[PDB]
């Protein structure tokens, strides 16, 4: 092995790991640093001591500490479990630095979690963070070695919410985020419900919602809304756009893979829409016919394979064209999608395609630039080129495209994310989120491009650690909203922050 172990008896061993999700003003328990022992204390130990670290900066942001034990070594803090954790709670002054606990109290337990209430007030500049380090661990009065796997280091937001978390509602995973704020002011959140696994379509996956109608505050119990019926009978990668009238519409896909799609027997595309600001929706009605395959009127297309949307939010132009792009198979000799734009001018009644946008594209995202046009981001997928995120525009309103080389600059280690057509002191800007990777889906960051110099900022890293899709969007006081997958094993988080508090 690749340490000496000896032979003169058991060896208890500590691990730790600070923590680095972000958090926000007036949470309860949130885990600062997490020890975890390697076996229970043994039968005959009567206390266990742990001291730490907190500097003054941190001391002032909390309310209260306490020591959380917990027969389960979680991810995330605690609360996002809803109790699936069972756990005990010690309180600690917040002025002190070291805890007992008794044996008997720890009743066998491995996993300690320092966690702390966290104060009304912040900053949120980059810098405002909270840490504390866990600095001496002892069983009886003997100290343990510590294994330190990472630095605590949690970032201020002026929001921060884990809004879908492996277990929730007896699913045990969730994927592919989609938010949206209706012009009322609603925040309509979307998921895949992945209730067996983290796997895509063929899997039998539902569709989930919650609501805020407070801007995101408080968020309504999860509904189920479209319910998968079995392998091959899942729904998901949800889009979202309100129309000019005002009703909602969802766009999702259902059955089989992508890859497994084939004209008779297709992957399809459905729409449902919603005219209460999301209470209810219609039952969901089949489009396919639109797109591609056996029912479609268009010859030339009823050979195409399968079809799906970028899952997040299409684009409404000022028009009131209804606009989502979607991905397609054209072929069963490559597995190469070619991307164009899927559209209706009649609030969703009948559904049209653009001319292709973009070959050998993936997930591709709109937006309005400031003089009418559309740009289109789309995802490089199979490390294509330089590993850059792909780009294309239209100035007729989505129905004809040419390549755009002069807004690529950012790379794309192959996810779906999301941009926002921001002005930033006086200059009109995109504001776009990607994983930063490199090369992997790690570091959930954005990045801001101005459109008048043609270059993109550095990128800031809004979350540490695994991150995959993210949608955004922009609420009414000027806050953004941001919907990312944090986590290996995911959960869907909605973090608000302003621009300055990111790139001042
Ligand atoms: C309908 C469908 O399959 N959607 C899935 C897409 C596509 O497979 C790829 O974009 C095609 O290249 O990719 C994911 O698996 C991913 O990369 O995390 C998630 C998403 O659920
Ligand atoms: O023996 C039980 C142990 O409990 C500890 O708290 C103490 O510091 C040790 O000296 C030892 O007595
Ligand atoms: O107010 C009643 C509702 O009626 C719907 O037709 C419309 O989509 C909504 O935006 C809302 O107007
Ligand atoms: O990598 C940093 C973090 O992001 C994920 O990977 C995971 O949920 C955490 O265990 C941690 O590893």
Same mark, same amino acid.
């Given at each position: 092995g690749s340490h000496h172990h000896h032979h003169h008896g058991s060896m208890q061993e500590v691990t730790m790991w600070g923590d680095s999700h972000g958090v926000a003003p007036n949470q309860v328990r949130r885990t600062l640093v997490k020890v975890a022992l390697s076996e229970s204390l043994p039968p005959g130990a009567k206390q266990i001591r742990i001291g730490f670290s907190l500097p003054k900066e941190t001391e002032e942001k909390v309310t209260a500490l306490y020591l959380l034990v917990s027969d389960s070594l979680?991810?995330?803090?605690?609360?996002?479990?809803?109790?699936? #954790? $069972?756990? =005990?709670?010690?309180?600690?002054?917040?002025?002190?630095?070291?805890?007992?606990?008794?044996?008997? $109290?720890?009743a066998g337990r491995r996993f300690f979690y320092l966690a702390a209430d966290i104060g009304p007030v912040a900053s949120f500049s980059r810098s405002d963070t909270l840490t504390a380090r866990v600095e001496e661990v002892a069983v009886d009065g003997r100290p343990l070695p510590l294994k330190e796997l990472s630095p605590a280091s949690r970032r201020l937001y002026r929001g921060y919410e884990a809004l879908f978390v492996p277990g929730?509602?007896? $699913?045990? /995973?969730?994927?592919?985020? &989609?938010?949206?704020?209706?012009? /009322?002011?609603?925040?309509? &959140?979307?998921?895949?419900?992945?209730?067996? /696994?983290?796997?895509?379509?063929?899997? =039998?996956?539902?569709?989930?919602?919650?609501?805020?109608?407070?801007?995101?505050? $408080?968020?309504?119990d999860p509904r189920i809304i479209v319910q998968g019926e079995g392998r /091959?009978?899942?729904?998901?990668?949800?889009?979202?756009?309100?129309?000019?009238?005002?009703k909602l519409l969802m766009i999702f896909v259902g059955g089989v893979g992508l890859w497994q799609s084939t004209p008779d027997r297709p992957q399809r595309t459905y729409i449902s829409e919603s005219r209460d600001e999301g209470l209810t929706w219609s039952p969901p009605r089949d489009i396919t016919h639109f797109i591609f395959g056996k029912d479609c009127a268009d010859p030339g297309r009823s050979r195409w394979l399968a079809s799906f949307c970028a899952s997040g939010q299409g684009l409404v132009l000022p028009s009131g064209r209804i606009?989502?792009?979607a991905a397609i198979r054209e072929s069963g000799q490559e597995y190469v999608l070619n991307n164009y734009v899927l559209y209706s001018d009649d609030e969703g009644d009948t559904w049209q395609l653009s001319d292709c946008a973009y070959r050998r594209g993936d997930e591709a995202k709109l937006s309005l630039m400031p003089d009418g046009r559309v740009l289109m981001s789309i995802r490089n997928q199979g490390r294509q080129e330089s590993r850059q995120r792909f780009f294309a525009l239209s100035s007729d309103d989505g129905l004809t495209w040419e390549r755009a080389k002069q807004f690529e600059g950012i790379h794309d280690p192959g996810c779906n994310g999301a941009m926002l057509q921001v002005k930033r002191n006086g200059r009109?800007? #995109?504001?776009?989120?990607?994983?930063?990777?490199?090369?992997?889906?790690?570091?959930?960051?954005?990045?801001?491009?101005?459109h008048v110099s043609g270059r993109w900022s550095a990128p800031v890293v809004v979350n540490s650690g695994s991150s995959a899709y993210?949608?955004?969007?922009?609420?009414?006081?000027?806050?953004?909203?941001?919907?990312?997958?944090?986590? =290996?094993?995911?959960?869907?988080?909605?973090?608000?922050? #302003?621009?300055?508090?990111?790139?001042?």
């Open positions: 979680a991810v995330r803090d605690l609360p996002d479990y809803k109790g699936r #954790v $069972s756990y =005990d709670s010690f309180p600690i002054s917040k002025e002190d630095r070291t805890t007992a606990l008794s044996a008997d $109290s720890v929730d509602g007896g $699913s045990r /995973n969730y994927r592919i985020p &989609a938010i949206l704020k209706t012009a /009322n002011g609603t925040l309509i &959140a979307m998921a895949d419900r992945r209730k067996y /696994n983290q796997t895509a379509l063929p899997e =039998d996956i539902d569709i989930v919602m919650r609501r805020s109608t407070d801007g995101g505050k $408080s968020w309504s /091959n009978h899942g729904f998901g990668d949800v889009a979202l756009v309100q129309t000019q009238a005002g606009t989502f792009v009109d800007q #995109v504001l776009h989120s990607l994983p930063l990777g490199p090369d992997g889906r790690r570091d959930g960051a954005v990045y801001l491009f101005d993210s949608d955004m969007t922009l609420l009414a006081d000027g806050t953004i909203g941001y919907f990312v997958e944090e986590g =290996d094993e995911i959960s869907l988080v909605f973090i608000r922050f #302003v621009l300055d508090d990111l790139f001042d």
